């Protein structure tokens, strides 16, 4: 199965306190392994998965100065951006960045990405090809001109096709019993009546890794999305995930519905029917 | 491993 390394960065300006709040996290697939928070006391990149802990002091020193240096960039970006859009200095504003690498089942490179947002809207993004930018805006256009003039794309392309995909491989190996494990979902079904003529069936999936699953209700062997509601999949908190899928049915005939559970850790897709 | 030493300013 394919994999990704992604970093997420958020800075929020705060007029009348001294510095933007800055929070950085790194993930491989669905498992964070690093964090930094400009308000915490250590002022260091912190490990959040057992397999990055084996990296030595050079790596931690290096990751911590890159992430501080990154929050320094965002300090400048907040003031530039307020100027581009002529905004009041009285208001709090948000800069977000995320960049990363996917590789395929054969762990070769599939794609890199680098995206940037101001106040929760698209600003500029590096296109697939890693040579080129799209800009949401005329403010974003002048940044794009800045970035073309300074050959930002080139460095990012070398990072993403090189170091990044390389370090993803290295992590996949060191963390293999954690990153290369599948936790097959524990499933179950509940029934509650809604109305005279109606009852709801909720099909459960718990303790799975990774987060991708597809939950579908069939009716007599056939897809049923009319009156089907999936909740957002959600962290259990222990590194695993949870999702349920519900169907609203003409009651009496509970047995006519089958829940179908697909997940990487399931040799074969799973079928579930209410037996009372 | 992060891109570095640091990102270009907007």
């Amino acid at each position: 199965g394919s994999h990704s390394m992604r970093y997420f960065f958020t800075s929020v300006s705060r007029p009348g306190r001294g510095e933007p709040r800055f929070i950085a996290v790194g993930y491989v697939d669905d498992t964070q392994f690093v964090r930094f928070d400009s308000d915490a006391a250590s002022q260091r990149m912190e490990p959040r998965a057992p397999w990055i802990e084996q990296e030595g002091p050079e790596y931690w020193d290096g990751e911590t100065r890159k992430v501080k240096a990154h929050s320094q960039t965002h300090r400048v970006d907040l003031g530039t951006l307020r100027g581009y859009y002529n905004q009041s200095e009285a208001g709090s504003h948000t800069v977000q960045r995320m960049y990363g690498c996917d590789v395929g089942s054969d762990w070769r490179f599939l794609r890199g990405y680098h995206q940037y947002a101001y106040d929760g809207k698209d600003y500029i993004a590096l296109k697939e090809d890693l040579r080129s930018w799209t800009a949401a805006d005329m403010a974003a256009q002048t940044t794009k001109h800045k970035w073309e003039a300074a050959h930002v794309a080139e460095q990012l392309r070398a990072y993403l096709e090189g170091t990044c995909v390389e370090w993803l491989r290295r992590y996949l190996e060191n963390g293999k019993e954690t990153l290369q494990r599948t936790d097959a979902p524990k499933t179950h079904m509940t029934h509650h009546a809604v109305s005279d003529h109606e009852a709801t069936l909720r099909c459960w999936a718990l303790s799975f890794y990774p987060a991708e699953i597809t939950l579908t209700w069939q009716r007599d062997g056939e897809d049923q999305t009319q009156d089907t509601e999936l909740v957002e999949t959600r962290p259990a908190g222990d590194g695993t995930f949870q999702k349920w899928a519900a169907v609203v049915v003409p009651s009496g005939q509970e047995q006519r519905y089958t829940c179908h559970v697909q997940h990487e850790g399931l040799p074969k897709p799973l079928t579930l029917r209410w037996e009372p | 491993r992060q891109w570095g030493p640091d990102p270009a300013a907007v």
Partner: T-cell receptor, first 109, second 115 residues
Framework: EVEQDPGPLSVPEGAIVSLNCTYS??????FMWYRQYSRKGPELLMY????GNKEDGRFTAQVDKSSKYISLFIRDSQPSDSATYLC???????????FGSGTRLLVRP | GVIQSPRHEVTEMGQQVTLRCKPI?????LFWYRQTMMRGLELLIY????????DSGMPEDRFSAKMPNASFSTLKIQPSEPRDSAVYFC??????????????FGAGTRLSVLE
Amino acid sequence: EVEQDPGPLSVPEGAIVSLNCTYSNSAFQYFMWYRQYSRKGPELLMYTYSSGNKEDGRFTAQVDKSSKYISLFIRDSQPSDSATYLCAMRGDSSYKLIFGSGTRLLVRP
Amino acid sequence: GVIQSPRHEVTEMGQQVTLRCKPISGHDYLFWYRQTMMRGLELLIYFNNNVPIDDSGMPEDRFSAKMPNASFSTLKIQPSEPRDSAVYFCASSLWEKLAKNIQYFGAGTRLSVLE
């Protein structure tokens, strides 16, 4: 660490000069050469991002990340090329440069 | 370009020595180096927006560097010692020049701390 022979090299004008450095830390990714006249500051010459070979005028700089070995060649050397030459390098985590100790070059008129 | 002072300092060990640097207007990175007249430079420290980024090369003890505002940096030695004699170079740049490995150097402070 960056090992560099101190010399001095003394060469007759017109000669091809070869200068180099070796290092031990893989993850050095940017390699550079500086020229420094005596009593002055270092002046950037040539700069090669992991990228083998880089020609400019009489100067060519090269990098072999396998043998961790780096070189600068100066064709048709001249008296004004007389200077100490220093190699410098970094990775991608800091702008901190590590220099070799320099090679003093004399080109005899 | 970058302006340093003093260009020259001769003093007795024991004394506080203070070196100063004004980067090129607009440059938001600044570097302090030292060269002991035998070898290559070493980086002592650099700053980005007046914040110290890499400190690696600062001596464990009698050395401290400040950047109270964007146009001004100091390096302090207290007390000074003969092994401190060196040419101290300041330099500054911008991202777009550092991505091509270019920085701008001051003319240097030449320091002899004598016994």
